[PDB]
Ligand binder design. Structure first.
Ligand SMILES: [Cl-]
Ligand SMILES: [Cl-]
Length: 176
């Protein structure tokens, strides 16, 4: 079993899905989280198995507030104390596959095949979405104040207080 190839194939499938329309409106989701997180989980999040984690996928346009070594802080709403989103390269675990539904455990004969595939796909996104975008920012593609179209995933624990900035893994990032 080749998890590197499998991941690359999932990524192509995910790219097609994002071209077709993927993610809830970022402002609506965050406003609902601020008002009523359980309603937000119900309306906007996926559950995998029977766990207490809630997997979100959002899309929108944000303004770059700060550029860091490991991501960008982005504002999607006005009048907030801190940026709404930290779009970072800190990609670990099953958040991408669980938020997107691109792969599930039942697709694999072994648990280790699922785990290695999730690792390979996180590598693709780290390198070819996030780190790639940070490099093109350094080369003049944008700066603080630029607008960025994004699709991003994040995971909440049921009953955890929402704290901003929400750290989210970007699946799509482009200057607008
Ligand atoms: Cl798109
Ligand atoms: Cl296993």
């Amino acid at each position: 079993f080749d998890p590197k190839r499998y991941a690359r194939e999932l990524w192509f499938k995910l790219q097609d899905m994002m071209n077709e329309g993927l993610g809830y409106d970022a402002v609506e989701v965050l406003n609902t989280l601020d008002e009523n997180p359980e309603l937000a989980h119900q309306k906007f999040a996926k559950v995998v198995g029977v766990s207490n984690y809630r997997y979100y996928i959002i899309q929108g346009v944000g303004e770059i507030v700060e550029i860091k070594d490991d991501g960008i802080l982005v504002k999607v709403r006005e009048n907030r104390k801190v940026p709404d989103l930290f779009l970072s390269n800190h990609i670990f675990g099953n958040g991408i596959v669980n938020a997107t539904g691109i792969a599930k455990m039942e697709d694999f004969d072994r648990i280790i095949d699922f785990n290695l595939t999730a690792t390979e796909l996180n590598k693709i996104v780290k390198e070819e979405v996030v780190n790639s975008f940070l490099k093109q920012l350094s080369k003049g593609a944008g700066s603080v104040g630029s607008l960025v179209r994004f699709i991003a995933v994040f995971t909440l624990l049921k009953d955890e207080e929402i704290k901003y900035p929400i750290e989210a893994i970007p699946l799509y990032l482009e200057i607008q």
